[PDB]
Amino acid sequence: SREQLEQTLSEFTGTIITVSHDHYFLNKLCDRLLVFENQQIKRFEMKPQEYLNKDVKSGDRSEEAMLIIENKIALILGELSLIDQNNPKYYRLDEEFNELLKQKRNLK
Amino acid sequence: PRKGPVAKRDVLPDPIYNSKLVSRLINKMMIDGKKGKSQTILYKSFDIIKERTGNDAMEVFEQALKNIMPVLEVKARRVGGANYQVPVEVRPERRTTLGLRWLVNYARLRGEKTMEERLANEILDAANNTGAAVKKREDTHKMAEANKAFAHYRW
Amino acid sequence: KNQRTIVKVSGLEKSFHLRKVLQNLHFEIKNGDRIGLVGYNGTGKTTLANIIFGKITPDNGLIEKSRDLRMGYLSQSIDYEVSHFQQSIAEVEEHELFQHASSLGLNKVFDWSEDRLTHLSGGEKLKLALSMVWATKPDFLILDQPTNHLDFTGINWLVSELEKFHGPVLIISHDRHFLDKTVNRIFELEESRIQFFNGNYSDYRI
Amino acid sequence: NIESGIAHIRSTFNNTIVTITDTHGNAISWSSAGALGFRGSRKSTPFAAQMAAETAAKGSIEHGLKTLEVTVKGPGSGREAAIRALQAAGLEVTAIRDVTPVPHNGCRPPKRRRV
RNA sequence: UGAUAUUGAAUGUUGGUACAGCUUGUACAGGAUAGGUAGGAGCCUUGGAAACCGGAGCGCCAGCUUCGGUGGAGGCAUCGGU
Numbered sequence: 001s002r003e004q005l006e007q008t009l010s011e012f013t014g015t016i017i018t019v020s021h022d023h024y025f026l027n028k029l030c031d032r033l034l035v036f037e038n039q040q041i042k043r044f045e046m047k048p049q050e051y052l053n054k055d056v057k058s059g060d061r062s063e064e065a066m067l068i069i070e071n072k073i074a075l076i077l078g079e080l081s082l083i084d085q086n087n088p089k090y091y092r093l094d095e096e097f098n099e100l101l102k103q104k105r106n107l108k
Numbered sequence: 109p110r111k112g113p114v115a116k117r118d119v120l121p122d123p124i125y126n127s128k129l130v131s132r133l134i135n136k137m138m139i140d141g142k143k144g145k146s147q148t149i150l151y152k153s154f155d156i157i158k159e160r161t162g163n164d165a166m167e168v169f170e171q172a173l174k175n176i177m178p179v180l181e182v183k184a185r186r187v188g189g190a191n192y193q194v195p196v197e198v199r200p201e202r203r204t205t206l207g208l209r210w211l212v213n214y215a216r217l218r219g220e221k222t223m224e225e226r227l228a229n230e231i232l233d234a235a236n237n238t239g240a241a242v243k244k245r246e247d248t249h250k251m252a253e254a255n256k257a258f259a260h261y262r263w
Numbered sequence: 264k265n266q267r268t269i270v271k272v273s274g275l276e277k278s279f280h281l282r283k284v285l286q287n288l289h290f291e292i293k294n295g296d297r298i299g300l301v302g303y304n305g306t307g308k309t310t311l312a313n314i315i316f317g318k319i320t321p322d323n324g325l326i327e328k329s330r331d332l333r334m335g336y337l338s339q340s341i342d343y344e345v346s347h348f349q350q351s352i353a354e355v356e357e358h359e360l361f362q363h364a365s366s367l368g369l370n371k372v373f374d375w376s377e378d379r380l381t382h383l384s385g386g387e388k389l390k391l392a393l394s395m396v397w398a399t400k401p402d403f404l405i406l407d408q409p410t411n412h413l414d415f416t417g418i419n420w421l422v423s424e425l426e427k428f429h430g431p432v433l434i435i436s437h438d439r440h441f442l443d444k445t446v447n448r449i450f451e452l453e454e455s456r457i458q459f460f461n462g463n464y465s466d467y468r469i
Numbered sequence: 470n471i472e473s474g475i476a477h478i479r480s481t482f483n484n485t486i487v488t489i490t491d492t493h494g495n496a497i498s499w500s501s502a503g504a505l506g507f508r509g510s511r512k513s514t515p516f517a518a519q520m521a522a523e524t525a526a527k528g529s530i531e532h533g534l535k536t537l538e539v540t541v542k543g544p545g546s547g548r549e550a551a552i553r554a555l556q557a558a559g560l561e562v563t564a565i566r567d568v569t570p571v572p573h574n575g576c577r578p579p580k581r582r583r584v
Numbered sequence: 585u586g587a588u589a590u591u592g593a594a595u596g597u598u599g600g601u602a603c604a605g606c607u608u609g610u611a612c613a614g615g616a617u618a619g620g621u622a623g624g625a626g627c628c629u630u631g632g633a634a635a636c637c638g639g640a641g642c643g644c645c646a647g648c649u650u651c652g653g654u655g656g657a658g659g660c661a662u663c664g665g666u
């Protein structure tokens with residue numbers, strides 16, 4: 001009965017409001033949340049599973065830096081993987097890589 | 109285009125808040141060249157922002173955009189059989205463009221009756237970064253981080 | 264203390280009208296057994312439990328149990344037990360009950376009005392019902408459909424507490440995950456005949 | 470509890486395995502792209518090699534290593550990422566040594582793919 | 585194929601029983617890791633209190649545990665609150 005209900009509700013094109021503490025059932029069916037917290041109802045535009053596994057945004061103004069710097073490390077690391085150490089281009093990429101790694105340490 | 113980068117277009121600062129960002133959002137809200145409607149919507153929204161929060165509307169708006177503007181986006185690249193999403197840094201101008209666009213679009217989808225109210229609520233959510241537009245920014249950052257391996261690829 | 268058989272069922276038959284529910288069931292519950300009684304709706308799981316508890320007399324068969332055995336029964340009609348909570352305060356040592364209650368998240372149960380106590384959430388009813396059963400210090404636990412209305416909190420509580428419990432536990436549940444944490448044996452009741460599987464519920468499925 | 474060890478990096482075209490052993494080759498710990506949940510194409514990428522090296526290193530640091538000798542095998546692209554990742558974990562890398570097996574004209578290779 | 589008789593000895597490993605010792609005990613608040621019950625206002629103290637350090641086990645990451653070395657007069661409570 002639960003399996004049949006799950007199949008049917010995934011197809012239903014109308015509005016569904018479900019209360020369940022079976023988070024699996026919720027996570028399969030629901031795409032948005034109304035959370036009852038601290039005597040307030042807040043609407044969140046995310047799945048049940050994502051809301052719980054969130055991580056506070058206390059340093060969300062800094063994650064932007066950690067994201068950009070790390071993505072540069074990935075780009076330079078990728079190129080180095082394809083080039084022999086004997087190519088003069090290797091030297092420049094390695095210096096930048098070590099310098100960028102220092103920045104990563106400073107942000108952490 | 110192939111020739112090379114093309115001259116971007118300036119906007120005048122809004123008469124009331126003396127802000128180019130406000131003016132740009134007004135253009136993003138405008139439909140069918142009806143700039144009147146969009147200016148009225150925004151000014152009414154900013155009154156709701158000040159009347160609700162009590163803080164200055166501009167400060168709330170600027171705080172909201174900060175939470176919306178993305179830093180890394182993903183660009184698709186067809187590498188043989190499978191298509192790879194390559195993470196790319198977002199130019200400062202593009203950050204502003206995406207922020208205003210995302211804000212406006214998701215604001216239009218909200219459930220309040222009037223756009224000004226809708227827009228106001230959306231900006232407030234972004235101020236606390238819990239709205240739809242915020243979620244969009246989360247998604248792109250997830251995609252970029254997930255496909256971080258392929259950053260090497262690029263044009 | 265040991266694994267001495269506490270409940271032994273043999274040739275248990277039970278019918279309603281013309282519908283056979285239980286047909287020739289032989290099983291034993293021993294000390295420390297954490298048994299999941301599974302099976303689809305209407306298979307007789309509650310009927311079986313009530314016969315084990317003694318609410319329903321079987322048509323045939325014998326139920327052997329220690330004469331002094333105390334059987335804590337969570338039951339399904341919580342409404343009746345929770346309505347008697349006012350009566351239970353006089354019969355149960357207040358202290359222990361309230362100690363549990365606070366853990367289950369029902370804070371300051373002492374102060375609740377009879378209005379609220381009649382208007383409870385179905386999840387509150389269960390939390391109050393659970394606390395009551397455990398304060399009675401039963402030697403054998405029967406938990407019909409637990410974790411139905413419980414939140415993350417009450418599920419973590421019911422798990423950590425079941426593990427601690429000394430006597431045997433018979434859990435009637437459809438919740439795969441609750442079974443996959445608390446039980447080591449599955450009793451599958453199908454076509455009025457019980458089949459036995461070792462381990463939790465996931466392996467039972469396989 | 471041992472300090473000096475060898476880091477065997479097996480970088481193939483499909484996966485990068487990193488085993489960490491003592492100087493006498495007793496396995497302390499190991500990690501591989503597959504072990505970290507990468508699948509298919511992802512395991513090959515040098516990014517995965519980095520993560521594999523880090524995970525192997527952090528497992529070893531419990532036993533208390535400080536200096537590593539690195540040996541690289543196979544034609545994969547992982548070696549540089551895995552080596553830099555080991556340095557970033559804190560363990561100093563004395564020397565890198567390519568020990569990819571080279572036959573002196575031995576066994577017939579498998580037939581060439583017609584892709 | 586198993587039990588058992590012919591059929592013995594020593595060791596190691598692993599369960600059950602009885603005894604003894606080491607000990608072991610964290611909801612929240614409360615000063616904090618409060619196992620239950622009983623008496624309970626004195627107890628310990630160069631026969632080493634507190635405090636410092638080292639060692640070790642546990643641990644809910646708060647912390648308690650005891651072998652100890654420095655250390656030398658307090659330390660703990662019923663009262664108080666929780």
Ligand SMILES: Nc1ncnc2c1ncn2[C@@H]1O[C@H](COP(=O)(O)OP(=O)(O)OP(=O)(O)O)[C@@H](O)[C@H]1O
Binds near residue numbers: 282311
């Ligand atoms: N007193 C009764 N009189 C008649 N029929 C009954 C009686 N009790 C149960 N039944 C029926 O016999 C079967 C036994 O139901 P029972 O409550 O024992 O099942 P269950 O395993 O608890 O199911 P569910 O999980 O759906 O509660 C069902 O068909 C039920 O309708």
